[PDB]
Design a protein around this ligand. Structure first.
Ligand SMILES: *[C@@H]1O[C@H](CO)[C@@H](O)[C@H](O)[C@H]1NC(C)=O
Lengths: 26, 257, 10
């Protein structure tokens, strides 16, 4: 139910260093 | 991983390390799909041409890792395998068709900030995301450059690497190689005209190719690092096991066992 | 170059 949400990222509303390039491509 | 960068802590809490008991050896990458199951490439366990036929007792799974070599006391978790499952139609003979396998842990792992499962795609996610040009991410402790005698330097990383790559159209993938491609595979990488570098490499197999969904904020495992011809070569692309396409086999195993 | 792990597992 909780798969895919990273505790130190998503669960805290934090983004990783290259995360946005993935979304830019979508 | 070639031309990647050090991963950040907790960036891929689903990254698992297939470690051999004896001799000690980093066998391959893997992925955590639940508290007792790991997904990996079949050739990581079975590949006759090079003599691999591992059993549940020759291996260990190490989850929550960062450092390739360090025993990360109180961060990493080491688990024992209960049983391994290989897709009955996996083809090691010619093209690694259906390169996938599941491993059931002896006991469930407790989740932490470093350990957390990734999501397996559904039709909808598979369709919206697995499109040419969309980028995915690949992680692993594999080689940094293709093995070659002229290389000077360290070919092994000290910590987990990461690299983002765009999905390539099926017909471009097909024309770049002479290996017979099937739909149970997809290719990723930059085209010659993009003049960019990045690739998975030896020791990266079994590792996940994930994508992040704009629709729900979650990470989906879309591929498994399976094979290539060289690493980072001009005009070549890396091949990944098409997870969605083999999903029926995945659910049947988890459901039964 | 792997640091040694607990024998138990080994
Ligand atoms: C691998 O080893 C297992 C041990 O039981 C055996 O059953 C299986 O036939 C072997 N397969 C190959 C292709 O070596």
């Amino acid at each position: 139910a909780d798969c895919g949400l990273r505790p130190l990222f998503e669960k805290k509303s934090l983004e990783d260093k290259t995360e946005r390039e993935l979304l830019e491509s979508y | 991983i070639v031309e990647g960068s050090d991963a950040e802590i907790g960036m891929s809490p689903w990254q698992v390390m297939l470690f051999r008991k004896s001799p000690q050896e980093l066998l391959c990458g893997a992925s955590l799909i639940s508290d007792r199951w790991v997904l990996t490439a079949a050739h990581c366990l079975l590949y006759p041409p090079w003599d691999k036929n591992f059993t549940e007792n020759d291996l260990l799974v190490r989850i929550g890792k960062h450092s390739r070599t360090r025993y990360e006391r109180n961060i990493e978790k080491i688990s024992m395998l209960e049983k391994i499952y290989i897709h009955p139609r996996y083809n090691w003979r010619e093209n690694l068709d259906r390169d996938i396998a599941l491993m059931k842990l002896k006991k469930p792992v407790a989740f932490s900030d470093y350990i957390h499962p990734v999501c397996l795609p559904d039709r909808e996610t598979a369709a919206s995301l697995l499109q040419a040009g969309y980028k995915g991410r690949v992680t692993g402790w594999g080689n940094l450059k293709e093995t070659w005698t002229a290389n000077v330097g360290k070919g092994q990383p000290s910590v987990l690497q990461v690299v983002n790559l765009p999905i390539v159209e099926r017909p471009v993938c097909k024309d770049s190689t002479r290996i017979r491609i099937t739909d149970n595979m997809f290719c990723a990488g930059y085209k010659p005209d993009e003049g960019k570098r990045g690739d998975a490499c030896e020791g990266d197999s079994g590792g996940p190719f994930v994508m992040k969904s704009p629709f729900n904020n979650r990470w989906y495992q879309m591929g498994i690092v399976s094979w290539g011809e060289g690493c980072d070569r001009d005009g070549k692309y890396g091949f990944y096991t098409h997870v969605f396409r083999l999903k029926k086999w995945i659910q049947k195993v988890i459901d039964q066992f | 170059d792997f640091e040694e792990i607990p024998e138990e597992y080994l």
